[PDB]
Amino acid sequence: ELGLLPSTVLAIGYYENFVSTVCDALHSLPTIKLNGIEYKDFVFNIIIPNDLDADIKRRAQIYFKKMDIHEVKILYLQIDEENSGDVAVLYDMPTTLGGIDKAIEMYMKKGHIGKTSQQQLLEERELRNFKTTLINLINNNSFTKTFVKVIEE
Amino acid sequence: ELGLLPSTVLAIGYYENFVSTVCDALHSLPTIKLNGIEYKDFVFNIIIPNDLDADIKRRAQIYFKKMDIHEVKILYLQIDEENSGDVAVLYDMPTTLGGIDKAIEMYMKKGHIGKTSQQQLLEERELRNFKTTLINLINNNSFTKTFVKVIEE
C-alpha cells in the first residue's frame, strides 16, 4: 500500500529537488563560507513536525525563532551558529508537507473545524511514512548518507 | 477519494513552487526580454504527458527537441520563438510527475517488466486528476488565470 501514498511522492520530490540540490551545492564550494566562517563539512538536520498543517512554513518560522537558528541562503536554509564549530549544523522543516492538508482541505465543504478520526490516523501514518522513505533515500546514496539526518520536532 | 491521491499534492506543489514562482518572476520584469526580444505578455503551456514514466524529464527532453522549442532560463523554461510575436509562448512538461512511477517502483521487487492492469488504471486516473487539480488552481487565481493553459501532449 506504500508507493501509492502522497507522503512517498513528497519525500522523493523533497529528496531529489531539495536535499540532493543543497548537498551538491555545498560540496561544490571551494570553501564553505557562511557569515564569514569557513567550515570543513556540514550536517543537514531535517525536522519532521510532530503535527501536520496546511501552513508548515508558518510552523517552521515559529520553530526556528523559538530555537534561535539564523537564516543561510545558497536557496535558503537555517544554521545554529552557536552549536556549529568546523561542522556547520543546518536545518529545514519540509514546507512541502503542508500539501497533505492542502489537498484534503481542497475537495471538501468550507465550514469544517478540526479533523475526523479517519483524518488524524491518516496524517499520523503519512508523517511516519515520509520520515521512513526520506531516511531510506538518504542512506542509499553516498552523496547524502553521511551529510543528512532526519529528527523529530 | 480526491485529496488523498498523490496527483493532488503533486499539482499543488507544482502550482505553488513552479507555476506561481514563474508568473510572478515574469510579471516582476520591467520588460520581458528573452534572446533580445521584448514581449508585452506570455502564455505558459503546461504539457500533460499522454503516458507516465519515472523519467518524465527524459520524455520532456525528447518532446521539446521533436517540437523545436529553445530553452529560456529565469529557473529554466522552453519558448517556441517561431510561433511567438508580442506574446511569448512558453512550455513545461512537469518532471514532478515522474515521482508517481518512482514511488510505485520503490517498495516493489526488482525484476518487474511492465505494469499490472491495476497499475495502468491508476496512472490514467492520476494523470487526469493532476490536470483537473492544476486547471482548478490556475483558474481560481487572478495571478495565473489568464497566463497559464494546460494541454495534452
Numbering used by the authors:
A (entry chain A), B (entry chain A): 5 to 78, 87 to 165
Quote the study on this structure:
A recent groundbreaking study discovered the ancient origins of the cGAS-STING pathway in bacteria, which play a similar role in the immune system to combat bacteriophage infections. Binding of cGG to bacterial STING causes it to oligomerize into long filaments and activates the nicotinamide adenine dinucleotide (NAD)+ cleavage activity of its fused N-terminal Toll/interleukin-1 receptor (TIR) domain. Depletion of the electron carrier NAD+ eventually leads to bacterial growth arrest or cell death, restricting the replication of invading phages in infected bacteria, a strategy called “abortive infection. In this study, we demonstrated two distinct mechanisms underlying the regulation of bacterial STINGs and a structural basis for cAA recognition and oligomerization.
To reveal the molecular mechanism underlying cAA recognition by ElSTING, we determined the 2.57 Å and 2.55 Å crystal structures of ligand-free and cAA-bound form of ElSTING, respectively, which forms canonical V-shaped dimer conformations. The ligand-binding pocket of CgSTING (~51 Å) is larger than that of ElSTING (~30 Å). CDN binding will induce the closure of the β-strand lids of CgSTING and ElSTING in nearly perpendicular directions. These structural differences result from the direction of rigid-body rotation upon ligand binding: with one protomer superimposed, the other ElSTING protomer rotated clockwise by ~26°, in contrast to the anti-clockwise rotation of CgSTING by ~21°. As a result, the ligand-binding pocket of ElSTING retains a nearly identical distance between the two stacking F169 residues; however, the distance between the two stacking residues in CgSTING is largely increased, facilitating the direct release of the ligand into the solvent upon inactivation.
